[PDB]
Nucleic acid binder design. Structure first.
Lengths: 180, 176
DNA sequence: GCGATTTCAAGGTGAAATCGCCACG
DNA sequence: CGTGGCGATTTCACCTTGAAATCGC
């Protein structure tokens, strides 16, 4: 029952759950402690998105999940939010795959961000302060690509960028605005 | 005409000559040189929007200079104007009735139009990517400096997910 | 009351620190 | 001798677990 992720146990536990089963019962039908079945589902609930940032989910501990699945809903638990956060930490994150250490610290590292960054974006959510995430980082001094969401308003800002790009963007933005 | 003279005389400005001298190496009244030079100044990206440059007057160059100013003067905001009206320029350039001067006049009047509103929503240049009847629902494009941005507001999440996704690749594709 | 969840004490575990044993100048 | 090497051991800090206390209706 462990070769694979508390999560895959969870997959099962839900399949039954979904079928009308109380954990108290599943625990029975499977031979698991009511207390584990909590945990196995508790984990099988973790925000797929976040879970997907880590290299060795196998190194992902439940308590982590508990806070991973915690950050999940404490951040609206909606596509556009998870999407945004990733963007933010992703740079510093892959930056963590450059750097020695074992699966142990990398885990604690990646999550450090998922929490801090998410807890930095959550600030301007009630504070309703404009939040920007740099879409791409340039070695350059004056070049930038970034997004800024300050409420229900949001913009895509670019500087010193190709003409091939204003070209493309302009084209696709205008046609997507046709589509809807 | 006067422009050409300008650009030519220009070479001599940088030749390190004073107008007074150039107004002699060309037996041109010095007033004339001032005027040629001022003309030589108008935005090349606008002067070349006229099929018959021979027909732009001084005051025309003079007011192209103007439009050019009022709008910062950098290429990217020109292209911004130059595309917004380019259809109606190739358009008017299809009309057969009107005489050549009627052409420049119509084209010039076009060029002044853009300048006024694009710099009203600003310096910067802002074109309305789309018009929503709501006092606070917009989707636009903005240029100023060598920097452009697509500003939106009060739109569906779905819209934002797509653009986000799209733009996502459009960069990934090229920054690579 | 009654599931579900968290708490508690009792085991695991791995990474890092220490230890053993050795072989070499 | 005095050392450095390096595979095995132990430490230590964090896990997981079931049971039983606790929660939250």
């Amino acid at each position: 029952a462990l070769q694979h992720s508390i999560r895959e146990i969870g997959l099962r536990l839900m399949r039954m759950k979904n079928d009308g089963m109380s954990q108290k019962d599943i625990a029975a039908k499977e031979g698991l402690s009511q207390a584990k079945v909590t945990r196995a589902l508790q984990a099988a609930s973790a925000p797929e998105e976040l879970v997907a940032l880590f290299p060795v989910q196998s190194e992902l501990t439940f308590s982590d999940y508990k806070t991973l699945c915690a950050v999940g809903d404490e951040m609206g638990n909606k596509n556009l939010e998870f999407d945004q956060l990733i963007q933010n930490i992703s740079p510093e994150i892959n930056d963590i795959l450059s750097i020695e250490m074992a699966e142990d610290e990398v885990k604690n590292k990646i999550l450090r961000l998922i929490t801090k960054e998410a807890s930095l974006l959550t600030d301007k959510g009630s504070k309703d302060k404009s939040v920007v995430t740099e879409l791409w980082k340039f070695e350059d001094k004056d070049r930038f690509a970034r997004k800024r969401v300050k409420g229900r308003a949001f913009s895509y800002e670019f500087n010193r960028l190709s003409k091939e790009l204003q070209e493309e963007l302009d084209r696709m933005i205008g046609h997507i605005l046709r589509k809807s």
